Design a protein around this ligand. Sequence first.
Ligand SMILES: [Zn+2]
Ligand SMILES: [Zn+2]
Ligand SMILES: [Zn+2]
Ligand SMILES: [Zn+2]
Length: 44
Amino acid sequence: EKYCCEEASEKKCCPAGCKGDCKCANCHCAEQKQCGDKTHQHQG
Ligand SMILES: [Zn+2]
Ligand SMILES: [Zn+2]
Ligand SMILES: [Zn+2]
Ligand SMILES: [Zn+2]
């Protein structure tokens, strides 16, 4: 639901809620990705 980062709550990283191809850096997003290779710190 909308942004899930503690900084990208507007356009710091994505235009409000990673649409998909946001290419986040804190959550490691990529065209709607889940990331977390070896259990990352991703808390969602
Ligand atoms: Zn996000
Ligand atoms: Zn993202
Ligand atoms: Zn994300
Ligand atoms: Zn990651």
